[PDB]
C-alpha atoms as an extended CHARMM CRD file, in Angstrom:
* protein
*
        38  EXT
         1         1  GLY       CA              0.0790000000       -0.0650000000        0.2590000000  PROA      1               0.0000000000
         2         2  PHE       CA              1.7230000000        3.5080000000        0.8870000000  PROA      2               0.0000000000
         3         3  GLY       CA              4.9740000000        1.8850000000        1.4270000000  PROA      3               0.0000000000
         4         4  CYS       CA              5.8130000000       -1.7900000000        1.4420000000  PROA      4               0.0000000000
         5         5  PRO       CA              5.7570000000       -4.0630000000        0.8600000000  PROA      5               0.0000000000
         6         6  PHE       CA              6.0200000000       -2.3440000000       -2.8970000000  PROA      6               0.0000000000
         7         7  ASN       CA              7.8460000000        1.2060000000       -0.8250000000  PROA      7               0.0000000000
         8         8  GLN       CA              9.5690000000       -0.0500000000        2.1480000000  PROA      8               0.0000000000
         9         9  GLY       CA             11.7650000000        3.2090000000        1.9550000000  PROA      9               0.0000000000
        10        10  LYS       CA              8.4030000000        5.4690000000        1.6500000000  PROA      10              0.0000000000
        11        11  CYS       CA              7.5650000000        4.7140000000        5.5160000000  PROA      11              0.0000000000
        12        12  HSD       CA             11.4920000000        3.0290000000        6.0520000000  PROA      12              0.0000000000
        13        13  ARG       CA             13.1090000000        6.4800000000        4.7540000000  PROA      13              0.0000000000
        14        14  HSD       CA             10.0420000000        8.8970000000        5.9090000000  PROA      14              0.0000000000
        15        15  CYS       CA             10.5000000000        7.9840000000        9.7620000000  PROA      15              0.0000000000
        16        16  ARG       CA             14.2660000000        6.8080000000        9.0890000000  PROA      16              0.0000000000
        17        17  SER       CA             14.7730000000       10.8310000000        8.8830000000  PROA      17              0.0000000000
        18        18  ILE       CA             12.5680000000       11.1510000000       11.5920000000  PROA      18              0.0000000000
        19        19  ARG       CA             16.1380000000        9.8820000000       13.8550000000  PROA      19              0.0000000000
        20        20  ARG       CA             13.5640000000        6.3750000000       13.3430000000  PROA      20              0.0000000000
        21        21  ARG       CA             15.0590000000        3.0010000000       12.5970000000  PROA      21              0.0000000000
        22        22  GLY       CA             12.8850000000        0.8920000000       11.5620000000  PROA      22              0.0000000000
        23        23  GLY       CA              9.0920000000        0.0920000000       10.9210000000  PROA      23              0.0000000000
        24        24  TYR       CA              6.7680000000       -2.0190000000        8.4670000000  PROA      24              0.0000000000
        25        25  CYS       CA              3.3660000000       -1.1790000000        6.8280000000  PROA      25              0.0000000000
        26        26  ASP       CA              0.0390000000       -1.2670000000        8.7040000000  PROA      26              0.0000000000
        27        27  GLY       CA             -2.6930000000       -1.1410000000        5.2390000000  PROA      27              0.0000000000
        28        28  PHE       CA             -2.7290000000       -2.9150000000        2.1560000000  PROA      28              0.0000000000
        29        29  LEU       CA             -4.4400000000       -0.1730000000       -0.0630000000  PROA      29              0.0000000000
        30        30  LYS       CA             -2.9410000000        4.0230000000        0.6990000000  PROA      30              0.0000000000
        31        31  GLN       CA             -3.2220000000        3.6700000000        4.3790000000  PROA      31              0.0000000000
        32        32  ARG       CA             -0.4060000000        5.0460000000        6.1520000000  PROA      32              0.0000000000
        33        33  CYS       CA              2.2710000000        3.0300000000        7.8250000000  PROA      33              0.0000000000
        34        34  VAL       CA              3.2910000000        3.3060000000       11.6660000000  PROA      34              0.0000000000
        35        35  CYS       CA              7.1630000000        2.4850000000       12.0000000000  PROA      35              0.0000000000
        36        36  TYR       CA              8.1460000000        0.9800000000       15.2210000000  PROA      36              0.0000000000
        37        37  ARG       CA              9.3400000000        3.8210000000       17.2190000000  PROA      37              0.0000000000
        38        38  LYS       CA              5.4670000000        5.2080000000       18.6170000000  PROA      38              0.0000000000
């Protein structure tokens, strides 16, 4: 969806920039991702 498993970077790079480190898409369609750290 919005990202992984097609574009993890889109959801793994957006958060990463926030000093984050890891994540996993949460949905099939353009829903939204929630990088590990909350």
